[PDB]
Symmetry: D2
Subunit: 209 residues, 4 copies
Amino acid sequence: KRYELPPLPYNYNALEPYIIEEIMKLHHQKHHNTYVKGANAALEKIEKHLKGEIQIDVRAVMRDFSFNYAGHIMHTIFWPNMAPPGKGGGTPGGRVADLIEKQFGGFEKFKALFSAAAKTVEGVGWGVLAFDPLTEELRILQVEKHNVLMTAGLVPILVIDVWEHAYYLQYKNDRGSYVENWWNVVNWDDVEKRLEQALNNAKPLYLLP
Amino acid sequence: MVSFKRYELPPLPYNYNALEPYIIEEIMKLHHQKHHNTYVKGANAALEKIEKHLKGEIQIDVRAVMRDFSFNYAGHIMHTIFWPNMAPPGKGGGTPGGRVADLIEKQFGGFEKFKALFSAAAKTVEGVGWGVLAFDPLTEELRILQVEKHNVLMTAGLVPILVIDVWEHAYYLQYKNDRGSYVENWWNVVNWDDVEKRLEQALNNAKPLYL
Amino acid sequence: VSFKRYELPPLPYNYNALEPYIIEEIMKLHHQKHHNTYVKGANAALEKIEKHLKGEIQIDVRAVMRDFSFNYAGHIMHTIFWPNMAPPGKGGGTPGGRVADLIEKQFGGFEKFKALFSAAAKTVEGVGWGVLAFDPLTEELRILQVEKHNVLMTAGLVPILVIDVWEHAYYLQYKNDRGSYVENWWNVVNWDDVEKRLEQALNNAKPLY
Amino acid sequence: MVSFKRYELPPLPYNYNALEPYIIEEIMKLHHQKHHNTYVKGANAALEKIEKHLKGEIQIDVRAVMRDFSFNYAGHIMHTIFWPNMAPPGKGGGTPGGRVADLIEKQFGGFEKFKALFSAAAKTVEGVGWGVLAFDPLTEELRILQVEKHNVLMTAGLVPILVIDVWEHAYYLQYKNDRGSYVENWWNVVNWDDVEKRLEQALNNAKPLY
Ligand SMILES: [Mn+2]
Ligand SMILES: [Mn+2]
Ligand SMILES: [Mn+2]
Ligand SMILES: [Mn+2]
């Protein structure tokens, strides 16, 4: 089954002033679309290989699949993780706030740690807040590229893209300012919904019921 | 604030010599007691550093500690899946039925085509790593990929349902450099019942986490 | 003796000297922000090693060496990158001399070389570099990619011509279109510099190993 | 267009059993005859694909083939340095003199401090890789780093003069999981004469190179 580019949940200019329209348009129509196409291209090669029509370098094509699939799913989460300022921004409540209190000692400490993780990604990558199916707790990590340092199990519920293309046109080299500004468009309702699903569904995938 | 729940080393589902002749007792023992244990400890040690940082007790390099967490957590979960993915010959080995066989037929064109591809993926991991059969929550289909170390090339979303460890420590004492022979022999201990149960859970649970 | 500090080199030309192919704002940010950050990071890693050697602190050796690796590599790669370019006239065109001779022998001529090098640069996954290197084991040219600054690079190979395809190298001008950037970059290649490096490599490299 | 010069497997500088009791004969045989040979073949195979691409016979994935070249070339050169970096106990082992000892004193505050740092670097490689002592052409000083696989974390410029292989295949048959004991014992076969000769060449050639 082939991957498809999802529409954004909002207008290309909907995250302004925090992320400009030009970035949103390039990011979605070029970058994300390229990962969708790359993932499908890798699958097509695997198909031709399985049908015996070609012989592929299995390692190489799977590396291509890994990178592009990861790019696709990460951007798929990234867009609805944001919302126009109002619906987006502010401080979380509910289950997310509760786990943030338990795991990190409150929102301010969480924000400082998450921001540090995002700002200090070496090269391009992501800051990731994930739900751990083994402990049913939150974990923060970095991902390099789309597919380096990511682990099995951990379910991303909030991600920030710190690839240079995510901010350079507006913030230039100042990734720090981008990260600080990104908090203003975080869709906590989306994160809350993701956590609800993870609490219900994640653990049984690994520790059988 | 509540102190993190510690990771723990699970027992094996069988004795150390239970996978003979395909994987020797000495490997199973070292693999479990030394290697898997080390990843459990490493994951806990990283979380302890994060805890002390959050309590204002120490300085940490956030990137470094998270790299440590990534590698060791990944090692832990991958081995946690690896052990029950195998079973003593008899319960282990053979060819799958059920939903696993159905998806293998529809996607890979049958078990032999799947086996050849999975074996090639495992054999050709560059350096140490894993061959992985995963459930894709976006398409509700199977995908095969490689993972290097424990935490390189792995992606979000994909749920491993069957993994083969091709780190050198998984085979060297018995098979020496001949990883190919190890991979071929490993099929004789695959626990298809476990794989089927994992797929069942994924079919029921995975997609809603993301969409 | 305290380690010798790395230093930011001046550019061989003004910030606007590579126009219209690479705009002034890019050259300024690239040199003053990005390259300077790698210099500072390389020095910072060695300061940590020094405090460890003085017995004052205990460090995570793996972590600090990863920092050294990335930042040292960033520093050296950019150090080669700047003089690898020159204002159009001195920069651009088709090489002669020893480099042209090896290009004929290894790659079957300049057009074939250019196509291969361009493909290598364009298809770097994530951020990184296209690299033309001298192989001390064979005394021949080899092309490879480097991801980040310090992934896929090998011992031995001496880079003689590099192109930076990190997003910051082109995004402000070329946006997502790395391909057009790579095509344009040829017009500022300083072939006299590449020639000097190859000659040094032919005379110096093999004995090291 | 002339066909590429092939990489070749260098012979060992000593018998397969010459590093005993510190590294057993079986490891040396497998390591040289199976593993190193595989990297030589892999590097050549990648270049063959590049050749066929340039001659218009095939259309390659340039990234994929260059990744193959990178890993295998790196494997080849790292092992090529690794073997003569060791010597039978007597010629091998002990502590360095000459220029190596001089820079070690200046950079690291002496041999025991250097040894502690290099040992820690080797023991703490995550996954498989190498501990590396390198000469920096930019500063004409020694640097220690790790390399993962053969071709991850390695940088341009730095010239390895002493390397230790900590891939599992380098020790597992003898030391099992105990990489630490392997690293501790490897010091007893280090060929300081070889390292000294490499440093001499680096001091003479590396900076003028860059
Ligand atoms: Mn992006
Ligand atoms: Mn293992
Ligand atoms: Mn750059
Ligand atoms: Mn080796």
